[PDB]
Amino acid sequence: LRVEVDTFMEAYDQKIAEEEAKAKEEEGVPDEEGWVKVTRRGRRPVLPRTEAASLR
């Protein structure tokens, strides 16, 4: 039981680390046709895309 738990968490943490590094690369950096993607990684707080925030 302990081996499988450690194995799955090792794989899960590696996937999370890759996503964070990719997002850090992609923050800012406008692409072609002039589009900038609004993310939470910036310094200006952003409105979340949730049902509770929209109704509020």
Partner: protein, 82 residues
Amino acid sequence: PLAKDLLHPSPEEEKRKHKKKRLVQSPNSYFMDVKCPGCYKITTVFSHAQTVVLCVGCSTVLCQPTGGKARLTEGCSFRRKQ
């Protein structure tokens, strides 16, 4: 005091001064085109908006008024105009 030419100010000087204290008044605001998720129709939104802007097609909340610049929703794509 430092010697500055009133007729020909430096590039970093005019962008740093107050908008009313420049040689010619010029606002710091702008208009931008935003694209909401769910439908990719383009909407023109003022930067210092004072009212919540809703997409015409899908009625999605685009921006929320703040003290200064309006905060855009997550996942939206914006571009300065002109």
